[PDB]
């Protein structure tokens, strides 16, 4: 994250590191526990490596440094990427992951609530980004989970700050007019969460942005409320 | 290479390193540029990691040190392993990598001539093996490309040493009985080039033999002259 600080154990108990094991293992993507067997991330995280054997998912951890090979992994029973997702595009950037084994919930490992379809036009005032991405452009993966509060930029004002690219209603933008607060490389698939009724809700999934925290270049996030029928369909 | 010495920038411009990139990068194999879009290498270089969008190919570099994010790298569009190759056995050990974008030849990066089908049984005499492999058993990957010359040993002299392994007309052997000069780990898929009529031509591809220059343990190489049919058939 650009322009944030260490999180604590149990602040963000839904956040997971997705890792790839080839010759060596490494963090690539964030995601969110939404149920015992279910993790929600971005489609672009599996662009290059769509083989689920290869992937490891880790929860209740504050630093990647605390993950070895003797650490229990959740593994992909099933990888559901929205059919409409095209491998080199920003649309339909969302994937569901069924785990082989249901997770045991703890102080440190909890699911986040999803919004109603009814929450589509709701205005959130208190929104946070988390992950182990870069703190700067030309940065490097962090050991300690980062967090940052970010204001939602309404969709029309976000469109006009990206003339080249096309902002959907199924996208949601966050950032300051200048600002150093934003998601970066390695924050892919991580949650934008907002507090609405005193509880946390996954409002967005880190998707794409032009640079990290550049002046007037807000981050763009898959808007989860808009995929709630897709989520019920693929989870039953 | 074992028994080798520092090659020199331009000495072997067909030589490429084959590397697995996630965030990190690891030199795993060598190959030979035979075409703007074509690299020839060993099938067993992709047994452990058969996923293509994880591989990177670097040509016209002398050291792996040279490489950072700056350094441009070809990517696999198609990976064509020999249909009769079997991980159990070391026969038909040959693979063609089709590069995404065509290569732009220089002093440092040029193809190499394939042998002709009729060249089978020709005895070549000015034979070189190149690669970044180990310089000793249980050694480590080399920063700077290593060249070494080596005599061929004909089949039936070779097949004597490989009591349980079948050495056939589709293979060449090369090494010194008491010589201790050979191809070690990381040289697999790398070229065995023997200068003949007047130019260097790829005669064999580094294949197998657990051991590096054990006395009386000559390197086995896929005999490129016996897959000319296959190679041209696969370059429609």
């Amino acid at each position: 994250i650009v322009g944030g600080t260490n999180a604590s154990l149990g602040e963000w108990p839904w956040q997971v590191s997705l890792q790839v094991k080839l010759v060596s293992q490494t963090h690539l993507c964030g995601g969110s526990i939404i149920g015992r067997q279910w993790v929600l991330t971005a489609a672009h995280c599996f662009d290059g490596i769509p083989y689920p054997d290869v992937w490891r998912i880790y929860g209740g951890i504050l630093s990647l440094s605390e993950i070895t090979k003797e650490t229990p992994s959740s593994r992909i029973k099933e990888l559901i990427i929205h059919q409409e997702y095209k491998v080199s595009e920003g649309n339909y950037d969302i994937a569901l992951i069924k785990l082989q084994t249901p997770l045991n919930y703890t102080e440190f490992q909890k699911p986040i609530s999803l919004p109603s379809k009814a929450d589509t036009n709701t205005i959130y005032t208190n929104c946070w980004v988390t992950g182990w991405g870069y703190t700067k452009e030309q940065g490097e993966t962090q050991n300690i989970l980062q967090k940052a509060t970010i204001p939602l930029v309404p969709n029309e004002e976000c469109q006009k700050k990206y003339r080249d690219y096309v902002i959907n209603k199924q996208m949601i933008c966050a950032g300051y007019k200048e600002g150093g607060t934003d998601a970066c490389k390695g924050d892919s698939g991580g949650p934008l969460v907002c507090k609405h009724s005193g509880r946390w809700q996954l409002v967005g999934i880190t998707s794409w942005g032009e640079g990290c925290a550049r002046k007037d270049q807000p981050g763009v996030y898959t808007k989860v409320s808009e995929y709630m029928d897709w989520i019920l369909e693929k989870t039953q | 290479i074992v028994g080798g010495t520092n090659a020199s920038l331009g000495e072997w411009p067909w030589q490429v390193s084959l590397q697995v990139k996630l965030v990190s990068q690891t030199h795993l194999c060598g190959g030979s540029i035979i075409g703007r879009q074509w690299v020839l290498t060993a099938a067993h270089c992709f047994d452990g990691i058969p996923y293509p969008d994880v591989w990177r190919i670097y040509g016209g570099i002398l050291s792996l040190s040279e490489i950072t994010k700056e350094t441009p790298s070809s990517r696999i569009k198609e990976l064509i392993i020999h249909q009769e190759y079997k991980v159990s056995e070391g026969n038909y050990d040959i693979a063609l990598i089709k590069l995404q974008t065509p290569l732009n030849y220089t002093e440092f990066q040029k193809p190499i001539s394939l042998p002709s089908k009729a060249d089978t049984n020709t005895i070549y005499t000015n034979c070189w093996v190149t690669g970044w492999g180990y310089t000793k058993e249980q050694g480590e990957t080399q920063n700077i490309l290593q060249k070494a010359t080596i005599p061929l040993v004909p089949n039936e002299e070779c097949q004597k040493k490989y009591r349980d392994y079948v050495i056939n007309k589709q293979m060449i052997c090369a090494g010194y009985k008491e010589g201790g000069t050979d191809a070690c780990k990381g040289d697999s898929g790398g070229p065995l080039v023997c200068k003949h009529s007047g130019r260097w031509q790829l005669v064999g591809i580094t294949s197998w033999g657990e051991g590096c220059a054990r006395k009386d343990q000559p390197g086995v190489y896929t005999k490129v002259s016996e897959y000319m049919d296959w190679i041209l058939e696969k370059t429609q």
Binding site: H27, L28, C29, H44, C45, D47, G48, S88, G90, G133, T141, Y165, A183, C184, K185, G186, D187, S188, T206, S207, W208, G209, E210, G211, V220 | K21, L22, V23, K69
Partner: peptide, 10 residues
């Protein structure tokens, strides 16, 4: 890796 890619490799 385009300009918009938030993805780690690049």
């Amino acid at each position: 890796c385009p300009a918009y890619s938030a993805y780690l490799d690049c």
